[PDB]
Amino acid sequence: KSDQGIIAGNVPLTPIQKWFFGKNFTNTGHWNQSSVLYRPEGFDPKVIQSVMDKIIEHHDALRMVYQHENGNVVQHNRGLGGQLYDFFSYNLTAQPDVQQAIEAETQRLHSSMNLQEGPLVKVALFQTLHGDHLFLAIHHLVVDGISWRILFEDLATGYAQALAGQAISLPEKTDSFQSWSQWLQEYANEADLLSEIPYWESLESQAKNVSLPKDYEVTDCKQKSVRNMRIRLHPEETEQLLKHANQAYQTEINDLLLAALGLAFAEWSKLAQIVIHLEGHGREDIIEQANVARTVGWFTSQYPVLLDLKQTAPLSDYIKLTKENMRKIPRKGIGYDILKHVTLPENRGSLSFRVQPEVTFNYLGQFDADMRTELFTRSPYSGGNTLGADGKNNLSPESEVYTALNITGLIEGGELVLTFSYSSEQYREESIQQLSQSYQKHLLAIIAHCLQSHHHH
Numbered sequence: 001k002s003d004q005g006i007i008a009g010n011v012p013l014t015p016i017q018k019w020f021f022g023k024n025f026t027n028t029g030h031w032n033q034s035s036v037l038y039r040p041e042g043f044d045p046k047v048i049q050s051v052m053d054k055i056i057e058h059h060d061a062l063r064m065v066y067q068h069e070n071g072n073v074v075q076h077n078r079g080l081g082g083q084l085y086d087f088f089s090y091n092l093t094a095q096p097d098v099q100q101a102i103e104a105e106t107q108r109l110h111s112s113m114n115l116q117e118g119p120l121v122k123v124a125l126f127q128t129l130h131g132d133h134l135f136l137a138i139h140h141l142v143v144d145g146i147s148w149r150i151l152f153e154d155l156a157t158g159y160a161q162a163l164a165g166q167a168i169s170l171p172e173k174t175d176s177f178q179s180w181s182q183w184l185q186e187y188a189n190e191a192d193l194l195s196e197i198p199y200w201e202s203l204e205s206q207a208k209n210v211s212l213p214k215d216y217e218v219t220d221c222k223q224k225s226v227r228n229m230r231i232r233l234h235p236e237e238t239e240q241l242l243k244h245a246n247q248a249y250q251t252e253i254n255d256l257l258l259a260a261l262g263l264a265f266a267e268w269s270k271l272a273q274i275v276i277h278l279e280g281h282g283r284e285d286i287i288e289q290a291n292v293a294r295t296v297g298w299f300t301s302q303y304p305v306l307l308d309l310k311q312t313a314p315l316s317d318y319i320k321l322t323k324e325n326m327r328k329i330p331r332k333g334i335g336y337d338i339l340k341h342v343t344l345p346e347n348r349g350s351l352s353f354r355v356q357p358e359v360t361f362n363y364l365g366q367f368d369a370d371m372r373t374e375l376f377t378r379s380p381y382s383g384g385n386t387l388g389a390d391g392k393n394n395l396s397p398e399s400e401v402y403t404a405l406n407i408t409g410l411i412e413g414g415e416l417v418l419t420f421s422y423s424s425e426q427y428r429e430e431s432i433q434q435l436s437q438s439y440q441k442h443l444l445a446i447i448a449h450c451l452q453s454h455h456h457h
């Protein structure tokens with residue numbers, strides 16, 4: 001029932017895309033996501049090209065191009081017939097240092113996106129004596145985490161079909177990114193979204209907008225200055241957090257992690273309140289009968305949450321209030337950025353959008369999009385090519401830092417691992433050691449409290 005035909009033509013910018021162009025990043029064409037896959041049997045360049053041809057024909061948004069001269073951004077979905085992706089194949093069988101070759105070339109390709117003409121997809125095959133490595137980089141304008149899951153699924157499906165001598169045949173298309181974006185433009189001025197204005201107005205009015213404290217005053221810090229500091233919970237405490245701690249107050253893991261975040265910022269920053277940038281997948285059921293379940297694009301939603309850091313006691317009430325705070329947000333928070341970037345000024349009430357969070361928090365769950373098929377797995381030579389916090393190759397070193405503290409959590413090897421990413425221009429390493437140790441302490445206290453509370457009741 002969704003459009004199975006070729007999608008082409010102009011596409012309105014969605015909120016996160018308007019955010020992106022509004023930043024006017026240095027080296028705007030180098031702002032990507034990437035991955036490296038490994039197949040011990042080896043990959044065939046001819047099969048890879050056949051499957052990628054079908055993938056990019058099928059997932060129309062990957063054919064997007066962007067004009068932006070004098071700030072006049074035009075997003076256009078190309079039809080078929082042009083360059084669908086850039087493909088390179090390398091014989092590394094003679095090389096002593098395969099890792100060096102892969103990092104150099106993946107970095108070269110990351111820096112080679114032509115936004116105006118495309119393609120926005122780079123593919124490189126590295127053949128070795130011990131299996132082959134397949135690099136993919138895609139500009140972020142046309143992709144997101146869920147989209148990568150879809151792409152890995154379809155790559156596995158098409159490759160298996162090719163190996164079996166069968167025609168490549170992907171799942172039916174869901175609704176186009178073009179159509180989705182057009183529908184969002186309509187939604188932006190309709191009654192359901194406008195009904196949220198009092199909520200968002202209340203948030204803005206409560207937001208004090210006090211500077212997140214930094215160690216040093218610096219302007220135009222760049223990605224090259226960013227450092228990552230990691231803490232983790234052992235498997236025992238991770239399992240308690242995932243499978244037992246939520247019973248006390250019937251929470252989700254994110255509620256407890258956000259509660260910990262408030263406690264840590266209360267201790268470390270001494271602020272009375274803090275606004276945090278959260279993210280949603282953005283594929284919410286806001287458009288009647290829309291279906292973007294297998295649609296490739298940048299759907300990600302960003303929204304603010306206000307944490308009260310004054311009233312952190314008793315811990316029981318603080319956890320319950322954090323849960324309640326999260327439950328009261330309308331429509332998983334998708335509305336605020338639509339109001340900000342798309343809604344007509346006349347429809348936006350008294351919203352001023354002065355809320356500019358410097359802290360982002362994202363809990364990503366389990367780490368495994370690239371590891372569901374027997375055909376390939378995550379490459380041990382992935383290096384700086386990832387979809388997450390360790391993807392040092394994804395952004396230009398001269399790209400501007402856009403968040404002071406980017407905090408991400410994920411489960412790897414049965415352990416919760418939290419990464420605190422910051423600019424070394426703005427903070428001493430010791431300051432972030434203090435924050436991350438505070439976070440760890442408060443999260444452990446929350447887990448202990450929840451286990452005892454559920455015993456008590």
Ligand code: NA
Pocket residue numbers: 254278279280361362363
């Ligand atoms: Na989140």
